[PDB]
Every structure is written in structure tokens, then in C-alpha cells.
Amino acid sequence: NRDDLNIRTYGATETSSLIMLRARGTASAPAAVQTGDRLGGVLFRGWNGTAWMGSGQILSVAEENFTTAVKTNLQFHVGGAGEAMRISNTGNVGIGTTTTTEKLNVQGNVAVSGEITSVRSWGIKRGPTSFSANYINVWNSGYHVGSSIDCTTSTTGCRILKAGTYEIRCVQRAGTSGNSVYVGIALNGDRTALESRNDVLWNHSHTAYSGSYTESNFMGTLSANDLITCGAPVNTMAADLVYAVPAYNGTMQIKRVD
Amino acid sequence: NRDDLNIRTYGATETSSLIMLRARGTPAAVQTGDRLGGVLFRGWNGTAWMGSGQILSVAEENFTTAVKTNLQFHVGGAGEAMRISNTGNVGIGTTTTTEKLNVQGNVAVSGEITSVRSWGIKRGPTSFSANYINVWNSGYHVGSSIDCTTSTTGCRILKAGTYEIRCVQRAGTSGNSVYVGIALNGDRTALESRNDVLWNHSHTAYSGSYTESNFMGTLSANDLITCGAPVNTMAADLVYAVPAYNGTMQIKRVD
Amino acid sequence: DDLNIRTYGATETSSLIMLRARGTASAPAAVQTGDRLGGVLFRGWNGTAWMGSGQILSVAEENFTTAVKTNLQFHVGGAGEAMRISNTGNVGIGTTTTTEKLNVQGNVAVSGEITSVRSWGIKRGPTSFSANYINVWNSGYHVGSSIDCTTSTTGCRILKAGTYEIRCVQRAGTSGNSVYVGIALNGDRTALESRNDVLWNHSHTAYSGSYTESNFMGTLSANDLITCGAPVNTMAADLVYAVPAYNGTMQIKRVD
């Protein structure tokens, strides 16, 4: 056939449709579609000199046995790369991947000419009120947004809930002793577990002026279930830091970077 | 009926088309919500020919007013998965297509993302305007969320969102304890008292050292963010001069 | 007036097939770049005429005697072409330039969270004074494609034009003298500080183990080498140079 196929509908309820139907069995004994069965396709082909070659296609394919549930995907294929985009039965879209774990998945880079808005995971601790253990203050409160960090369940740190990269800064005020003081960020009180890693930034300063801040910083990947703490290295140095409710006396801030 | 449908075109200028046409009446112009056509997939489940994906073209306006349509991509299971509106705007998991791409869910990218990020700065505290409000010699910004140039005394938040802010200023030569604070148009409490934000500040005295103040949390459109000394009598003990190393305010949109 | 294609069987399926050649049936010729292989077109009556109401096209991106390469195009009534999928699999929304795997000409709104690789790098351990505003650093580390902190001991090299947020710190020694460091472009502080489109600052400190800090925020160019250190050699005697990162670090994050 060389003629364009025209489907024309006049009316208020009806529409024009190309309908592609798939069953197993026969018209006399139809059987349910099975996982992996192609329901149908719109196929493009082009002459290359010697053969008709696949030149793009849009496919509907079953992803569950239909006697169990009607679940399908849509596939968009181009000449060259082959399958370029998938829409799974969940509605989840993959570009360059067929594993559609999130609502949109891109196997590659993304370039946007304007701006991107999204929920970003971050959390804070505020108000160092007592020394719990080395490198672990008790904090009066915490707060967080998103799903990667929990800063409210534990009074002594922020819990990492997802593997990821995190940027962390902890500050606390020196008291009035005039002695040198510092705080450090730690993994459940273990400073070395962070500081000794060759894939992170870990630092801290000293201070002595009353009301000035000693600071500690971390940048790098953390593991789910990690409790991030911050505090004085030892009890006698905690005696020389300010412990009180207002956040200006001390805070920890954690941002998910990636 | 059981046979594949083929459309074959040869030659230099023409192409193969499946064309689906819709009118109302028997002829009446297409109305909003009318389907122009669809490619429909159906599969036997043992009881019926069940919807197994479809690609639809649907009118978004009455055609006597304007020819506006959307394209819809449906799957068996979730139903409509992706929409392209007459604006070209794409929705995945939503039919509300406000921006060029809208995703109702999370996005996972294996590589890196480039985009315009909103941020703004104030540089060079040149005088005390009010409690927690310096006059700044200049400002600069990128993007659409923050305006650091219209006013010399603060950065205006143009869009509701989450912001990370740090303000620093140098102590002078008095040896007195000095500090600065970030504020909402001079009102420090309006930020500090919130249980959904970080707000802090340090003291310093050594000449050329920084007092710093930090904020993290949501701000509202039209908010004017300021930073400065808590009281006029302290201004004499801070450094006010043009170079940015004397003091700056940095605002980054986080989300 | 519907068109139905029904298939019963274990392996057979229903297809609409659109084929394109040049030439004639007895003397065909290969598809050329820009030829349409086929299309699904929608049209709607507006009262006067049949108006374009969306289309899905397959179009050649190479001469087929060289290679079979096509794109898919999705057009809507109103804006016209809205999405393109190139032969590489790269997708454009609002643009036909498909440089990356996804390209959006506009804004993007996500209700949830986005995960992606972010470029960042660090230098750790100021071990010597090399030149004004240039420390030698014991080690570097980076993630991503925009920043290289391991090739040069004296800085982080920007590999791609972009916006960067940079903080450098170093500990004062035991003298009680005023010390500072600054971020620089290959030791040239003024090259950054004098720019009206950037933040550049630094502090002084004197207390032993306290930090002097310098900060930068703004755009940088490919091949820029970012350094940080004391302003002059005589001040090195009053800063701490040693391997542990708590003595000093530089952190660079790509912002955009």
C-alpha cells in the first residue's frame, strides 16, 4: 500500500483510533497475554541501498502476566542507538536506561538553560547543652528537610539515611577561661573514622576569645545509618566551651551535595 | 483485521503518513477535551481486551478560539504517565505543566547536571544604616530568585525558597567585642525565633578578624535580607570601607 | 472508521509499518539525511479547515548508505515541535540541540529530590610556601569532571567554565603576629579580587591554631589554576605548614 491511511470521525463522543490488539491462543480459544509479549508497534523502515532497515519504532510490551495484572511499558527506539526512552507500568521514565527506579531516570548528563527547583536534603543541630562523650555534644534541638538526613530522632547527632555526599560545618563558642578550645565532627564520637579517610575533607580550628567560634568541617561521602556527632575532644575542654540553648552558641549544619 | 498495515512511499519528496482527523457534528469545530485521535494498544487478559498503553492527541481549547492540543502517553498500570501540553511543556507523573519539564517524584541522574543557580552577594560595608542593616558599596546576583542590586541595604528575596546565607565583617582596632547579624529588614528575631531555621553569630575582637553570622532555611517572596551591627554604638568598632575583604553577605538558593 | 490490527499467537504481534525509499519500486535509492520515514499526524476541524493537531515523526539524520540514524519528533498543536529524540538517544525538550542525554530549554520543577554527580575538589595539608598566594599542598582529591585537584600540587585546575564556590583556611602559628591567606588565580589575587561579578574576601587572625580564611564565589574559565596562600614569604614563618588537613585546606564546589 502506498496511500496514506486516513481515519476520520465526525461526532461528539467517538474518535478516530488505530487499535492494535494482542492475544495468545486463537480466535476460537483466546489466551491471556504473558510477560514480555509485544502488544503492538508503530514501526518505521528505510531503504539503505540493499535492504529495508529498522528506522525507529514505538512499542507496547507486557511486563506482567495479564491473568495476574495488566502492566505494560512503552518503548521509543531510534535508528542508531536503539531503545532510547522507556515508560514503565509505574509511570516511571528512563532515558538511556530500562531500569526505571525513580519517576525520571537519566543515564547521562542533563543540561538545563533555566533553573531547577526540587527538595534538597539538609539538616541542623542547634544549642549545645551538655557534653555526652568525646566529640559528642547533646543538642537542644534539630531540624531537617528531605529524606537523606534525620536530625531530630537523636539528641546527640544527625543520622544519615541514604548513601551520599555531605557537606558539614560545626561551630561552637569559646567560654571565658582564655584557654585554647576546639570541637570536631565525628562518626558517633569517632573522629579518626572520618579524618583518616583519603577521600574526604576533615578540618578544625582552635579559638580562645570569649564568644568566638571554633569550627570543624567535613566534606565527603557517608554511609546510611551513620550518626554524625560534633563536640569537644575531652571533658575538661568541654568545661571551657559555652553550653546553652540559643543556637548562636553552637550549631551543626549538614547538606546533601549530590 | 489480522494483517499488518503497511504504508510505503518511494521518491524524492513524499512520505508515508497515518492521518487521524476529528470534527464534531456530522461538520462542527473540535471542542476542548475532544480526542483528535489515538494509537491504542489492547491485550487479552482472559476476560477482556484491556488497555495496554496508548498515545493520544487531545484538544486543550475550542478550535474556533485556538488550535491547542496535548499529547498523552499512557501505560497499562499507572494510566497516563507523560503529557506534552500545547505550550510544549512536559509533565511526568503530573498533568500540571507549569515549567518546560515537571516531574512529580524524584529524578536520578547518573552523570552531572548543569543549570542556572540563583545566588547573590553584597560587598563592602560602607556605613551603618540601622540595627542589623549595613549600607553596602555594591551587590551582584545571578538568576531570578535574589535581587542584590536594587537596594544598597539588602538583598530582596524574589521567590519563596530555601536559602543559605553567610555574612562576615572585620573588627576594627578598639579591642572591644563586636558582632554582626543577618536580619529580615533589620529584624533579627523574625529569623532567629523560628524553629525551622539555623541562625547563629559569633563575636570577635582581633583587628581584621571576622565576626560571622549564618542563616539556613526558607524565606518568603518580597523579604529584604540585611546584615549589620546590632547597635549604632558598635559601628565605630567595626571596619566600614569599600573593599570586599572588609565585609560581605552571600546568599545561595538551596532548592 | 477505526483501523484494527488483531494478532493471536505465542510470538506474532500487530504492526503498523511505514517505509520510505527514494527512487522507484524497481530502482529504489537510499534514504537521505532529513527525509521523513513516516509519521502519525493528527488534524482537527476548526470551522474553516483541517488544522495540525500534533504529530509523531521519524526523520533520517544520516544517509542510510552510510548508517541508519534517525530521530523521533513529537509536535503539539500550538508550540509545534516539543520533544526530539536523536539517533544517539539524546532527548531535547524545547530545543533541537541534543548535546547531552537530556536537554531542557526552560526551567525544571521536581516535587521530590534529585540525585546526580556533583563536581567538587579539595586540597589538604599546606606543606610549603611556593609563591605569593600559592601554597604547596600535600594532597588533593576530586569528584566529577569540572575540577582537577590532583594533577598540580599548587592548586586546583578548573576544567570546564562554570561557577565555583571556594573557601581556603590555614592555621596561625605561635607568634601572635597578624597573618592571612588569600585565594588567587595562579598566585594573582587581583585577577579575582578586582572583578565586579565575584565575591572575594579574606580575614586576619593571630591566635595559635585559629584560622585565617579566604572566600571566592563566581565564574571561572577552563584551565584556570586556583591557588591559595600567604601574601608574602616573610609571613610563612608565622603560619603552620604540615601534612594534617586541620592545618589548612582549600575546598572548591561547582555551583551550577
Residue numbers in the entry:
A (entry chain A): 850 to 1107
B (entry chain B): 850 to 875, 879 to 1107
C (entry chain C): 852 to 1107
Publication text:
Bdellovibrio bacteriovorus is a bacterium that preys upon a wide range of other Gram-negative bacteria, entering their periplasm and consuming them from within. Proteomic and structural analyses of vesicle contents reveal several fibre-like proteins, which we name the mosaic adhesive trimer (MAT) superfamily, and show localization on the predator surface before prey encounter. Structural studies reveal a variety of domain usages (and therefore binding capabilities) at the fibre C-termini, placing these on intertwined trimeric β-prisms. Using independent but complementary approaches, we identified and characterized a MAT superfamily of trimeric fibre proteins with diverse adhesive tips, able to fulfil the long-sought-after role of multiplicity of molecular recognition and handling of diverse epitopes (across a wide prey range), by the bacterial predator B. bacteriovorus.
We next characterized two more divergent NS74s, Bd2439 and Bd2734, obtaining a tip-only variant of Bd2734 (residues T691–L843, 1.8 Å) and a longer construct of Bd2439 (G837–D1107, 1.6 Å). The resulting structures reveal that both proteins use a related fold. Bd2439 is modular, formed by a β-helix N850–V968, a R969 linker that coordinates the carboxy terminus and a compact β-domain tip from S970–D1107. Mapping a sequence alignment to Bd2439 identifies a conserved interfacial pocket (Y1031, R1040, E1044, H1053 and H1055 from one monomer; R1022 and Y1097 from another). These residues coordinate two hydroxyl groups from a bound ethylene glycol. Bd2439 showed strong binding to Proteus mirabilis OXK glycan, with weaker (but significant) binding to glycans from E. coli K-235 and Serratia marcescens. The multiplicity of the MAT family prevents exhaustive and absolute specificity determination (as suggested by our knockout phenotypes), but we use Bd2439 as a proof of principle to link to recognition of bacteria with Proteus-like O-antigen chemistries, revealing a molecular basis for B. bacteriovorus prey handling.
